[PDB]
């Protein structure tokens, strides 16, 4: 991780970074994960320190050495893909990248289901309703909601049954179920860590959600689906498909639903 | 009336000072509600409707 390597003295940060690569080769196959990449290797043109410019050069050479270190893959994480020195993203080195972003409503439900695998839920618990209400929440926040709801159920029942100790009877644990009130309480206590960032997802709006505009709904299908559903006709007649359409008119007529509805049918973000 | 000195001699249970989950959750809920009440934007009529309950 960036800040730990940077907390070291000059020479120690470079040696420690090199050791990780040498150990990975000895333990190959191996994966080296560098967290807070922007902290260990910030843009050189954005800093003044010699040590920061040096550690970037050290990482750049170690990344190039991966052509010799067989079966070693280096992964890294940052908050913004453009907050790191661009040299790291040149051919070779970190030549691949994946946008993780923020889970959508379906993913948030999946996360809640994952972090409830062991939890006994009451019939009134509705995690889909929670996933729709938890706008701006990420997996770290949804995990907190599951654990906090578990604790509330444990304190209401089990804490009046058990001692302040580390060992509990299996039957007492199994008798404890978490109700919707405990999830709602946790929801009021938690605060989304990613509420301002834009969230990109496949929308749930379908054509049945739009009143009127029957010809526009069809027109969008012709503009978006036909160029790939019938490509032989576009080639046959020398047609150049349009790259987009502009909508104009009064507000509040469904313009947002038109773009979402075609994205929904096409299973597109 | 005549007070009896014996009325002031009482020993508490050892568990007296150990608060329950309901007593601790109630206090923390009231702490959150007290901060929320200070944050609420409301007119004088809504303020009096609550205050008048104790009269
Ligand atoms: N033609 C329509 N059919 C059904 N609902 C509509 C229609 N037009 C607008 N709405 C409703 O109005 C809301 C706002 O629509 P939107 O296109 O976001 O307006 P804006 O011009 O402010 O973007 C939507 O959530 C939708 O539910």
């Amino acid at each position: 991780n960036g800040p730990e390597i940077m907390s070291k003295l000059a020479g120690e940060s470079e040696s420690n970074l090199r050791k990780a690569f040498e150990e990975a080769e000895k333990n190959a196959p191996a994966i080296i994960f560098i967290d807070e990449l922007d902290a260990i290797a910030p843009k050189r043109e954005k800093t003044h320190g010699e040590v920061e410019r040096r550690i970037v050069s050290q990482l750049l050479t170690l990344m190039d050495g991966l052509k010799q270190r067989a079966h070693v893959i280096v992964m890294a994480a940052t908050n913004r893909p453009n907050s790191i020195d661009p040299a790291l993203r040149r051919f070779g080195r970190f030549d691949r990248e994946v946008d993780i972003g923020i889970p959508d409503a379906t993913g948030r439900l999946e996360i809640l289901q994952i972090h409830t695998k062991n939890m006994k839920l009451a019939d009134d618990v509705d995690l889909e309703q929670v996933a729709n209400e938890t706008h701006g929440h990420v997996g770290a926040d949804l995990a907190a909601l599951c654990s906090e709801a578990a604790l509330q159920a444990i304190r209401k029942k089990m804490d009046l049954i058990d001692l302040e100790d580390e060992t509990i009877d299996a039957e007492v644990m199994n008798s404890l179920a978490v109700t919707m009130d405990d999830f709602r309480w946790a929801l009021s206590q938690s605060n989304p860590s990613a509420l301002r960032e834009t969230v990109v997802e496949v929308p749930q709006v379908t054509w049945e959600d739009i009143g009127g505009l029957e010809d526009v709904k069809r027109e969008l299908q012709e503009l978006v689906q036909y160029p790939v559903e019938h490509p032989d006709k576009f080639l046959k007649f020398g047609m150049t498909p349009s790259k987009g359409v502009l909508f104009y008119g009064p507000p509040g007529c469904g313009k947002t639903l038109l773009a979402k509805a075609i994205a929904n049918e096409c299973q597109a973000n | 009336f005549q007070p009896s000195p014996l009325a002031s001699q009482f020993e508490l249970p050892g568990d007296f000072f150990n608060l329950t989950a309901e007593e601790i959750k109630r206090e923390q809920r009231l702490r959150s509600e007290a901060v929320e009440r200070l944050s609420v934007l409301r007119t004088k009529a809504m303020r009096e409707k609550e205050e008048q309950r104790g009269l």
Side-chain angles (χ1 to χ4, degrees):
Chain A
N1 69 84
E4 183 170 358
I5 297 297
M6 291 296 100
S7 78
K8 307 299 185 186
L9 301 172
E12 294 175 342
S13 62
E14 296 82 5
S15 181
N16 288 340
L17 184 63
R18 290 196 301 269
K19 287 178 180 180
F21 276 74
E22 288 291 302
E23 291 297 320
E25 185 173 21
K26 289 191 290 184
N27 290 275
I31 298 166
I32 301 169
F33 176 73
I34 301 167
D35 201 352
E36 299 196 22
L37 183 63
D38 54 283
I40 201 168
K43 289 179 171 176
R44 285 172 284 182
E45 67 271 19
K46 301 299 186 181
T47 189
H48 311 292
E50 180 175 344
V51 173
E52 288 68 19
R53 292 195 297 279
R54 186 170 304 287
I55 196 69
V56 170
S57 295
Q58 182 68 78
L59 181 57
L60 290 167
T61 59
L62 290 167
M63 288 303 296
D64 284 341
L66 295 170
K67 70 184 181 181
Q68 296 179 333
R69 297 189 175 89
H71 323 305
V72 178
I73 300 167
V74 180
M75 298 183 79
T78 187
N79 290 338
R80 183 178 179 182
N82 290 314
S83 65
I84 65 169
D85 192 285
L88 292 166
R89 295 162 65 188
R90 292 173 182 172
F91 285 104
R93 301 190 178 97
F94 291 97
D95 59 356
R96 297 290 184 274
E97 71 183 30
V98 180
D99 185 351
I100 303 304
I102 298 167
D104 62 13
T106 300
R108 290 199 295 272
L109 174 56
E110 182 70 27
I111 292 167
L112 290 168
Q113 290 172 348
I114 289 166
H115 290 262
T116 53
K117 283 179 187 177
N118 299 330
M119 286 171 66
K120 183 178 178 179
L121 306 178
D123 289 345
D124 58 310
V125 175
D126 184 336
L127 296 176
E128 183 174 357
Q129 182 63 34
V130 173
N132 287 334
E133 293 177 6
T134 50
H135 190 72
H137 291 254
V138 298
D141 301 310
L142 298 169
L145 291 173
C146 292
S147 293
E148 285 292 353
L151 181 63
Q152 290 287 294
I154 291 165
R155 293 295 179 191
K156 286 177 176 175
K157 183 169 181 173
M158 290 175 70
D159 194 66
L160 302 175
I161 298 167
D162 290 315
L163 300 174
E164 183 63 50
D165 209 332
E166 299 297 321
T167 300
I168 302 166
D169 193 308
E171 289 184 355
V172 172
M173 293 171 74
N174 193 56
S175 79
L176 190 270
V178 181
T179 65
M180 187 64 187
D181 290 344
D182 292 340
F183 283 97
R184 289 181 186 280
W185 181 88
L187 183 59
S188 293
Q189 297 294 306
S190 178
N191 290 278
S193 64
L195 185 61
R196 292 178 178 86
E197 292 87 333
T198 300
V199 180
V200 174
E201 67 181 84
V202 178
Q204 302 302 303
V205 174
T206 185
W207 296 118
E208 295 178 355
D209 295 315
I210 301 165
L213 306 174
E214 294 81 0
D215 291 288
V216 177
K217 294 188 278 189
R218 286 190 290 272
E219 183 172 359
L220 283 168
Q221 291 171 321
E222 291 175 353
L223 292 168
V224 175
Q225 296 171 341
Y226 276 43
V228 297
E229 293 298 322
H230 304 281
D232 56 309
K233 274 82 185 168
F234 285 83
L235 293 168
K236 181 179 175 68
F237 289 106
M239 182 69 197
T240 299
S242 175
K243 296 191 185 184
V245 62
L246 183 144
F247 289 93
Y248 67 100
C253 299
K255 290 187 185 76
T256 203
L257 299 178
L258 290 169
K260 289 177 179 179
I262 187 67
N264 175 261
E265 187 176 30
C266 299
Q267 297 290 288
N269 283 306
Chain B
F1 299 91
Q2 170 69 56
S4 175
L6 294 172
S8 296
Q9 298 174 15
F10 183 70
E11 182 178 56
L12 296 176
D15 58 307
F16 177 93
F17 295 96
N18 294 326
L19 294 174
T20 66
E22 294 78 8
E23 290 174 315
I24 295 166
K25 181 177 183 290
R26 177 183 63 197
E27 170 61 11
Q28 189 61 22
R29 176 177 61 80
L30 292 170
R31 288 174 183 168
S32 297
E33 291 176 2
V35 172
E36 289 172 354
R37 283 195 293 269
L38 293 171
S39 294
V40 169
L41 177 64
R42 62 179 177 174
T43 60
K44 178 175 174 178
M46 295 309 293
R47 183 172 294 113
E48 288 185 337
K49 284 175 179 175
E50 182 176 1
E51 289 177 355
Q52 288 172 341
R53 181 179 180 274
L55 299 176

